[PDB]
From a paper:
Cullin-[name] [name] ligases (CRLs) comprise one of the most important cellular regulatory systems. The scaffolding module contains an elongated cullin-family (or “CUL”) protein that on one end connects to the substrate receptor and, on the other, to a [name] domain-containing RBX-family protein. A CRL’s E3 ligase activity is controlled by linkage of the [name]-like protein [name] to the cullin subunit. Here, using a combination of biochemical, cell biological, and structural approaches, we unexpectedly discovered that the UCEs catalyzing the crucial first step of [name]-mediated regulation—priming of substrate—differ between CUL1- and [name]-based CRLs.
Thus, to understand how a substrate receptor could impact the binding and activity to drive UBE2R-family E2 priming of neddylated CRL2FEM1C substrates, we obtained cryoelectron microscopy (cryo-EM) data for a stable complex mimicking this reaction. To obtain a proxy for the assembly catalyzing substrate priming, [name]’s Gly75 was first cross-linked to a Cys replacement for an acceptor Lys on [name] peptide, which was then reacted with [name]’s active site Cys in the presence of neddylated CRL2FEM1C (importantly, nonspecific cross-linkers were not used during sample preparation that could bias the structure). The map, at overall 3.7 Å resolution, allowed clear placement of previous structures into the cryo-EM density and iterative rounds of model building (with side chains when visible in the cryo-EM maps) and refinement. The [name]-mediated priming structure showed two striking features. First, comparison to the only other structure representing a CRL-E2 complex ubiquitylating a substrate—neddylated CRL1FBXW1 with well-established UBE2D-family priming enzymes38—showed that, despite some shifting relative to the cullin C-terminal region, both E2~ubiquitins display their active sites toward the substrate receptors. Second, the substrate receptor—[name]—makes extensive, direct contacts with the UCE [name]. Loops emanating from all three [name] tetratricopeptide repeat (TPR) motifs converge at the interface with [name], which itself contributes a helix-turn-helix element located at the C-terminal end of the catalytic [name] domain and a loop immediately distal to the central β-sheet to the interface. Second, mutagenesis of residues located at the [name]-[name] interface resulted in substantial defects in ubiquitylation without generally affecting enzyme activity. For instance, the catalytic efficiency of E88R [name] was reduced nearly 300-fold, whereas E88R [name] activity was not compromised with neddylated CRL2VHL and Hif1α peptide substrate. In summary, the cryo-EM structure of [name] bound to CRL2FEM1C illuminates a unique interface between [name] and [name] that is required for rapid priming kinetics of a substrate recruited to this particular CRL-UCE pairing.
Numbering used by the authors:
A (entry chain G): 1 to 99
B (entry chain R): 21 to 59, 67 to 105
C (entry chain F): 442, 450 to 455
D (entry chain C): 7 to 33, 38 to 65, 68 to 99, 111 to 154, 157 to 187
E (entry chain U): 1 to 75
F (entry chain H): 3 to 240, 245 to 278, 282 to 290, 296 to 332, 334 to 373, 376 to 396, 404 to 617
G (entry chain A): 1 to 122, 134 to 381, 384 to 496, 503 to 626, 633 to 647
H (entry chain D): 17 to 51, 57 to 86, 88 to 112
């Protein structure tokens, strides 16, 4: 029942694994491990909805059928500049030339 | 004059009656089978004057029926 | 009574 | 090996009380049984040798000669063809050894021509029975000379009367 | 006179017969004294088959002699 | 409908058909008469079975099925293209022939083998039909496709009256068939000394056929002493002719005294002055040349047997007879428990046969070898040298057959030979021998596989090894196929693993069709594409059954790469990869469809 | 910018490849980035659209490796007697470089190189690491062979004592011979085997021949053994310090063969002498190195057998007191135990020497002064063990002694003689009620059955079951009879089980009430079971007579003969010999014996043929 | 315990080391005088690397095993995928 995720920030992309009962504070520990930032300065997103740091991947969604290994789901992130907030940003991948 | 109170004696016995044996397993009739000797079973009889074994006659009954000397029939009763 | 041949 | 005791008892009984043409020098599993030349018929002037590798009431033995023979009911390698050696009345589980030897010594007296094994010997013996071939007589005389030489070398020759 | 015959069961028996009875009669006596039909009988004496249609005198069988009884056989 | 009008014509019920022919008109009464009922026609069956009353009525309705060739049965065999007159003749139905002719049937219409009504009546010997056909302009000298004349077949079947009548009516006594056979030979082969004497009354000349045989020799081969005795005093024949039958006796009748009767009348006149005999270049027979040494012959049978073999081989010259008799004596000795000498007599026979038939029966000798080996080894111990020799002589025939380029080899004898070779390899697999000849046998297998042979359905030697139908090994306990050990040597020797048959299949496909996990694992380890696409766009994995071998047997995700995943999209959408990829991957795409 | 097939210059690519390719072989610092960038150049060169070029890359790399190996050859040859030190460093560097280069050329390896000919035939193209190792082999095959082998053999000749040569250098130099790994077809070790294993084995053989001669020049067999064992252990420990783990067996085999086989005559005399004496620490030391030297045991085993046989004969008949069979068993047990303990303690098993002990024992057991006495004493011992009561015999020890006696029984050759004696003892014990416990008899019969065979011991089991059946049939007849003034206890015996089947020849008459008792018993037994004739024996039936006519009443436990005599005397006080003879029918010898036994205590008196005896009231006893 | 990959456009992708060692070329590029370590590529577009990384977490999860889904490949990147698979030997 383990879900598969794929996090992005600008051009950066991280591939990870998690269990369907895992808390947000657990995923934002692997995120801290991959790139060294404290877990208190991240605002993990989904679409345009901020994720509360109390869910267990149940209320936010991320079922075991919408996040299959060959079709991972999308989750964003946004760090801080020590003064104010920074909006989410993702630039797309290079498109096929003409198909 | 003299008298007696108790008398003890011994005696030997043998089927000095049938005066025969088993022609299949080649032993005396009042003797154990070789398969039985490899370690209580009885002895069978035939409608003929021939008296056969029990385990020998069963083992050959798994293949045929009649007397091994007389290819006629089998009774097994007495 | 093998010879599995024929003329 | 359960029947070895009974086989040995029968061997001892027959050794103590032979009947006719039954000499055993057993060393059964390797019975070096010897067959004698009963008189008042063909050959009879020599004593043969034979072997058996009997593997008893269900599995027939394998009677094999040593000196070659020339008559219809024998295989030239070493074997004889006898109906009671193959499972109406054929190979009853009883009648183990004495009947077999009696049948063999009877069969080496008038071979069956309806179903032969050595066809050349069958034709030659049929011609002799029709009668004068002398080929069967010649080969018989030669082989009895050889067997008499062997018996003089080892053992004692079989007399005409007992 | 009398002759001796050895049956297949190892036991030995004797028959009171004269040199005039036929071989068929001999086989019949062996049957009644033992219990084996004549069709499955073969008499051998001095290593020779005893034909049914004959008599003991044809084979020069003296008294006190011995006869071996075996089963039948073919080619 | 018409299938009922004809089965009453065959069975002859005349009252039934008259009422089925009153319930229909005269225009469609002809359509049912021209039936295809089990290959024949109502009028044909009406003649084969002699139903005169119904054949006459059948013809009053429509005389147009009268020369139709259909199927007939005689002696169990079936004859194609036989017209009704021919069939009425072969059966003896004299009055059916007379009626058929009075309605204007051709006395000359034959079967497909070109057998005339005249020849048909000569076979079973219907003299009165023969006379009638001759009187109605039959041609005495039309023969079947082999050139066998009426007179010939009449002599072969021993019909003296008919043969006389045919000669009386002017038949040519000296016809030769295509194989060079003459009526004088048919007398010899049937022992018809009578008819031979009659043919000589017409100055019949005594000739060799294609096989080089005179009637005198032909009578010796087939064993007819009356001819051979008659011809040893005929001035038209030149000791030599009365010594092959002596060995023929030992071959056929096995009467040793009959043979000793001769070789003495064939040696007293040989010396009654001296003549020598050709020397050789088998047990070292060294046939007897001295009469004094030719006195002890019934003393031993083996000397007589080998001398007879030698004289037959010498005089007859290498022909099915001599090889047949050599293999005959070999088989007899093998039956009589002389396995050492019984095998040696067969290799010489095979060598002799490897000259005149560069054959339907060379494979027969090979399979007889295989049967003997299977009997011997299934328990004297089998020696490695003889088995190697038989394997090399087996490969030689295939190499000779394929090497010539003058006609394709029909794919069934090649299949039989390949099955024999595979069985031989399986037998070789479990005989212990040292390492000085393991390299030799492996080199032989390498040179055999490098020939690139083909079989039934354009099959490869690996295909047969991974096929269950190849298990035809004989009538003896076991050489079961497919087996791991037999194919192990095949891949270990250098056999191609990605060869394609007519159906565009691969070894892996045939292995998967029979659900054998070990064979498939071995092939994949050796190297073969798991995604090969056959003619009807199928893969190897999709050809699986049940669940036990479907699951946990072979996992497909292990033997599949992204390279082989991206090829499927290209071949399903036709993206024209012609010049946009490196040249190496073009074949990869072309095979990974 | 794209992985599409392209056309590119060649000299510009090689001028950049040759710079990185040089640092990899020689193990210099290459930047991480350049290592990744260089991977694309090989792929680009391998898929150029017009005239793809991989053959040129292969040939140029071959040239480079050849030049490098030749330069290293020259530099290491100009070494001035320091070949070993330089060769090792260069070999380490080259091996690491070749592995890394094989890593770098992966695409050319997988795409082009795997287009060689075949396995074998049953200039050639090879991979990159294989080619580099081949070039090093061409460096080290024709030159630097004699010098390297000579220096290595000089080191393993300074073997004996001396200083401590650098283990790392020598081990690496020897290991270099086995680093041809891609060559795996029935012979991955041929090069090492020939080139090194021949001279090393020859040198070791010569050296240890000389050492063995020198050692034997000034030592005896008690001292030669320890030194041999020391020098055959030092070689073992120092063979795993320099060589490859496939030459230990051969080196030890050669050393052992040379020494022991060449000097095998010296040790045979010593082993002949010391087996007689104790020499507790000598058999093990000699055996440990005589076991493996071809065939030398057949002498030691034979002399051990001879010593055991002589020691046994020194006790089995030394005293011959002819009063106690138990001494025989005690002595055999002591000898067997001592020898088995010694062999298991010193020789470490050696089933062959157990067989030798067995062969000596089966000959001492049948010791004889020109039949064997062993069966009689064994049977007497078994009987005397199972007696009624004596001293303090206990039933928890007789089983233990029987479990030891079976060992002595195993060695008896005359198996059939023992059966008769034991059967007689068992019959006399059972048909007289002198046994101790029936459970013990079952134990003895079970041990004999499990040691000998089922068919060999059927008769005694039949007798035991017959005793049980008689015990039951007594009660059965007691119940069935009442449906006789003499108390009854009968025994029903078999026919072939009981070896007392003497054919009767005396028709003795039967007492009066015995007739009615016999009739009743016969009819009742026939009713209970039919198909058996019950014979009567007159020589074991013993009754008793209770007399009260004299002053002291007496009880005479007496067999049937004297009861018949007393019954004949019942009618008249005086009975003559004629009526004594005609009252029964038997051989006169038995009647005379009975009369003489009666007169021995003189319960009757005489006043022959017609002698008239009479009752004697003048005899009294207890 | 992860490796970093860079495409030809400027995207940084991160996968696990055991996942990345499925392809022989990456194993060779890491085994040598090269061993967060960046394996830089200069001939691979973003939309092909983003798919090969996803395929990496497909042969490490469904190995030695049910209802295995079929890998989806868009028809518009098939040629690039075939070219890149040969280079990466995945
Ligand atoms: Zn029985
Ligand atoms: Zn039983
Ligand atoms: Zn009966």
């Amino acid at each position: 029942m383990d879900v598969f995720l794929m996090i992005r920030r600008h051009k950066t992309t991280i591939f990870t694994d998690a269990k369907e009962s895992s808390t947000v504070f657990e995923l934002k520990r692997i995120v801290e491990g991959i790139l060294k930032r404290p877990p208190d300065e991240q605002r993990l997103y989904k679409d345009d909805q901020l994720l509360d740091d109390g869910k267990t991947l149940g209320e936010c969604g991320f079922t075991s059928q919408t996040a299959r290994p060959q079709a991972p789901a999308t989750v964003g992130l946004a760090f801080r500049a020590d003064d104010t907030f920074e909006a989410l940003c993702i630039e797309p991948f290079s498109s096929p030339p003409e198909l | 004059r003299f008298e007696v109170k108790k008398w003890n004696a011994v005696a030997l016995w043998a089927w000095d009656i049938v005066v025969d044996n088993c022609a299949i397993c080649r032993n005396h009739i009042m003797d154990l089978c070789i398969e039985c000797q490899a370690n209580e079973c009885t002895v069978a009889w035939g409608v003929c004057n021939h008296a056969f074994h029990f385990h020998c006659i069963s083992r050959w009954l798994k293949t045929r029926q009649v007397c091994p000397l007389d290819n006629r029939e089998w009774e097994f009763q007495k | 009574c093998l010879g599995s041949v024929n003329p | 090996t359960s029947s070895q005791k009974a086989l040995m008892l029968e061997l001892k009984s027959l050794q103590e009380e032979p009947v006719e043409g039954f000499r055993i020098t057993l060393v059964l599993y390797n019975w070096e049984v010897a067959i004698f030349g009963p008189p008042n018929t063909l050959y009879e002037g020599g004593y043969f040798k034979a072997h058996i590798k009997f593997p008893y009431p269900y599995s027939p033995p394998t009677f094999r000669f040593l000196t070659k023979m020339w008559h219809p009911n024998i295989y030239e390698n070493g074997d004889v063809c006898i109906s009671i050696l193959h499972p109406s009345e054929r190979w009853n589980p009883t009648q183990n050894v004495r009947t077999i030897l009696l049948s063999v010594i009877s069969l080496l007296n008038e071979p069956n021509t309806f179903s032969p094994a050595n066809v050349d010997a069958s034709v030659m013996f049929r011609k002799w029975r029709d009668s004068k071939d002398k080929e069967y007589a010649e080969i018989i005389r030669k082989q009895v000379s050889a067997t008499k030489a062997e018996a003089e070398k080892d053992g004692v020759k079989v007399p005409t009367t007992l | 006179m009398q002759i001796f015959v050895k049956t297949l069961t190892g036991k030995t028996i004797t028959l009171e017969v004269e040199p005039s009875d036929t071989i068929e009669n001999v086989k019949a006596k062996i049957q009644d004294k033992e219990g084996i039909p004549p069709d499955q009988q073969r008499l051998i004496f001095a290593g020779k088959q005893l034909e049914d249609g004959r008599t003991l005198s044809d084979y020069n069988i003296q008294k006190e002699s011995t006869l071996h009884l075996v089963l039948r056989l073919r080619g | 409908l018409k299938t009922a009008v004809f089965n009453a014509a065959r069975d002859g019920k005349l009252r039934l058909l008259t009422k089925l022919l009153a319930s229909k008109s005269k225009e469609e009464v002809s359509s049912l008469i021209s039936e295809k009922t089990n290959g024949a026609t109502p009028l044909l069956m009406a003649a084969r079975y002699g139903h005169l009353d119904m054949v006459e009525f059948l013809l009053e309705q429509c005389s147009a099925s009268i020369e139709v060739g259909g199927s007939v049965n005689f002696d169990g065999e079936t004859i194609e293209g036989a017209p009704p007159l021919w069939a009425a003749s072969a059966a003896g139905h004299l009055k059916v022939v007379q009626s058929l002719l009075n309605h204007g049937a051709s006395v000359n219409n034959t079967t497909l083998t070109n057998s005339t009504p005249l020849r048909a009546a000569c076979f079973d010997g219907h003299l009165e039909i023969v006379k009638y056909l001759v009187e109605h302009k039959a041609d005495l000298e039309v023969s079947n496709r082999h050139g066998h004349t009426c007179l010939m077949i009449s002599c072969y079947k021993g019909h003296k009256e008919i043969a006389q009548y045919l000669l009386e009516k002017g038949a040519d006594v000296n016809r030769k068939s295509v194989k060079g056979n003459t009526a004088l030979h048919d007398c010899a082969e049937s022992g018809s000394l009578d008819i031979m004497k009659m043919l000589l009354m017409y100055c019949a000349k005594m000739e060799k056929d294609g096989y080089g045989m005179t009637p005198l020799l032909s009578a010796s081969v087939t064993g007819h002493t009356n001819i051979v005795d008659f011809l040893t005093h005929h001035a038209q024949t030149s000791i030599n002719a009365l010594e092959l039958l002596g060995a023929t006796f030992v071959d056929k009748k096995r009467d040793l005294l009959g043979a000793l009767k001769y070789w003495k009348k064939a040696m007293n006149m040989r010396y009654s002055n001296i003549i020598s005999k050709p020397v050789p270049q088998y047990d070292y027979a060294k046939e007897v040349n001295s009469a004094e040494e030719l006195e002890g012959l019934i003393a031993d049978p083996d000397e007589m047997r080998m001398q007879a073999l030698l004289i037959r081989e010498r005089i007859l010259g290498p022909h099915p007879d001599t090889s047949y008799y050599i293999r005959y004596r070999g088989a007899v000795y093998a039956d009589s428990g002389n396995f050492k000498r019984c095998i040696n007599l067969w290799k010489y026979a095979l060598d002799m046969q490897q000259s005149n038939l560069d054959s339907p029966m060379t494979a027969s000798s090979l399979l007889s070898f295989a049967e003997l080996f299977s009997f011997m080894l299934q328990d004297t111990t089998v020696t490695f040298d003889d088995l190697m020799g038989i394997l090399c002589k087996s490969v030689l025939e295939i190499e000779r057959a394929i090497k010539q380029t003058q006609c394709p080899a029909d794919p069934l004898q090649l299949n039989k030979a390949l099955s024999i070779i595979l069985h031989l390899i399986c037998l070789l697999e479990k005989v212990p021998c040292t390492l000085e000849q393991d390299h030799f046998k492996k080199q032989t297998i390498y040179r055999f596989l490098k020939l690139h042979p083909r079989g039934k359905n354009n099959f490869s030697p690996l295909h047969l090894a991974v096929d269950k139908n190849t298990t035809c090994v004989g009538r003896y306990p076991v050489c079961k196929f497919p087996s791991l050990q037999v194919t192990a040597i095949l891949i270990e020797c250098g056999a191609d693993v990605n060869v394609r048959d007519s159906d565009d299949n691969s070894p892996l496909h045939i292995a998967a069709l029979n659900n054998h996990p070990d064979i498939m694992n071995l092939l994949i380890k050796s190297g073969a594409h798991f995604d090969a696409t056959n003619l009807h766009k199928q893969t190897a994995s999709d050809l699986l059954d049940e669940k036990e071998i479907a699951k946990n047997l072979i996992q497909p995700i292990n033997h599949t790469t992204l390279q082989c995943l991206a090829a499927r999209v290209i071949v399903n959408h036709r993206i024209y990869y012609k010049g946009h990829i490196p040249e190496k991957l073009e074949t990869f795409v072309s095979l990974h469809r | 910018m794209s992985l599409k097939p392209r056309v590119v210059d060649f000299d510009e690519t090689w001028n950049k490849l040759l710079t990185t390719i040089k640092a990899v072989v020689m193990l210099e610092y290459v930047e991480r980035a350049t290592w990744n960038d260089r991977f694309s150049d090989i792929y680009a060169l391998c898929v150029a659209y017009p005239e793809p070029l991989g053959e040129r890359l292969y040939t140029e790399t071959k040239i480079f490796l050849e030049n490098h190996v030749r330069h290293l050859h020259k530099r290491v040859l100009e070494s001035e007697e320091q070949v070993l030190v330089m060769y090792h460093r260069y070999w380490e560097e080259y091996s690491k470089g070749a592995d890394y280069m094989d890593c770098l050329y992966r695409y050319l390896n997988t795409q082009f190189i795997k287009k060689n000919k075949l396995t074998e035939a049953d200039e050639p193209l090879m991979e990159i690491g294989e080619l580099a190792l081949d070039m090093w082999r061409k460096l080290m095959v024709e030159p630097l062979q004699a010098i390297l082998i000579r220096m290595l053999l000089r080191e393993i000749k300074n073997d004996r004592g001396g200083e401590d040569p650098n283990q790392k250098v020598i081990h690496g130099v020897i290991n270099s011979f086995v680093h041809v790994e891609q060559y795996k077809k029935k012979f991955p070790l041929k090069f090492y085997q020939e080139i090194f294993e021949s001279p090393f084995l020859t040198e070791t053989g010569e050296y240890y021949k000389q050492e063995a001669s020198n050692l034997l020049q000034e030592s005896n067999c008690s001292q030669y053994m320890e030194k041999v064992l020391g020098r055959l252990k030092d070689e073992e420990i120092r063979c795993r310090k320099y060589l490859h783990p496939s030459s230990y067996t051969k080196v030890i085999h050669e050393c052992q063969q040379r020494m022991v086989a060449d000097h095998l005559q010296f040790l045979h005399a010593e082993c002949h002498n010391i087996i007689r004496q104790e020499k507790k620490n000598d058999m093990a030391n000699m055996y440990v190195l005589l076991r493996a030297v071809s065939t030398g045991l057949p002498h030691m085993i034979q002399e051990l057998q001879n010593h055991i046989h002589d020691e046994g004969l020194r006790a089995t008949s030394n005293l011959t007191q002819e009063n106690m069979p138990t001494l025989f068993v005690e002595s055999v047990l002591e000898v067997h135990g001592k020898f088995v303990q010694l062999i298991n303690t010193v020789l470490n098993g050696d089933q062959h020497f157990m067989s030798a002990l067995d062969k000596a024992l089966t000959s001492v057991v049948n010791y004889r002064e020109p039949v064997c006495k062993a069966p009689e004493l064994l049977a007497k011992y078994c009987d005397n063990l199972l007696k009624k009561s004596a001293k303090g015999m206990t039933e928890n020890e007789v089983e233990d002694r029987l479990t030891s006696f079976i060992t002595v029984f195993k060695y008896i050759d005359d198996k059939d003689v023992f059966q008769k004696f034991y059967a007689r003892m068992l019959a006399k014990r059972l048909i007289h009620g002198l046994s101790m416990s029936m459970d013990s008899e079952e134990a003895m019969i079970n041990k004999l059955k499990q040691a000998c065979g089922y068919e060999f011991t059927s008769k005694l089991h039949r007798m035991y079951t017959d005793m049980s059946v008689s015990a039951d049939l007594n009660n059965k007849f007691n119940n069935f009879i009442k449906n006789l003034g003499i108390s009854f206890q009968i025994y029903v015996l078999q026919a072939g089980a009981w070896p007392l089947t003497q054919a009767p020849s005396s028709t003795f008459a039967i007492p009066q009430e015995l007739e009615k008792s016999v009739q009743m018993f016969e009819l009742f037994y026939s009713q209970h079971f039919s198909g058996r004739k019950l014979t009567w024996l007159h020589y074991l039936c013993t009754g008793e007579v209770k007399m009260n006519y004299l002053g002291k009443p007496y009880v005479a436990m007496v067999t049937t003969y004297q009861m018949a005599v007393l019954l004949a005397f019942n009618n008249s006080e005086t009975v003559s010999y004629k009526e004594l003879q005609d009252s029964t029918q038997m051989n006169e010898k038995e009647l005379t014996k009975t009369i003489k036994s009666l007169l021995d205590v003189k319960m009757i008196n005489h006043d022959d043929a017609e002698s008239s005896f009479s009752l004697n009231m003048n005899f009294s006893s207890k | 315990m992860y490796v970093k990959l860079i495409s030809s456009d400027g995207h940084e992708f991160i996968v696990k080391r055991e996942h990345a060692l499925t392809s022989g070329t990456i194993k060779a590029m890491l085994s040598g005088p090269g061993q967060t370590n960046e394996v830089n590529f200069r001939e691979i577009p973003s939309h092909v690397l983003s798919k090969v990384c996803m395929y990496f977490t497909y042969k490490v999860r469904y190995t030695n095993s049910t209802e295995i889904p079929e890998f989806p490949i868009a028809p518009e990147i098939a040629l690039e995928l075939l070219m890149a698979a040969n280079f990466l030997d995945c």
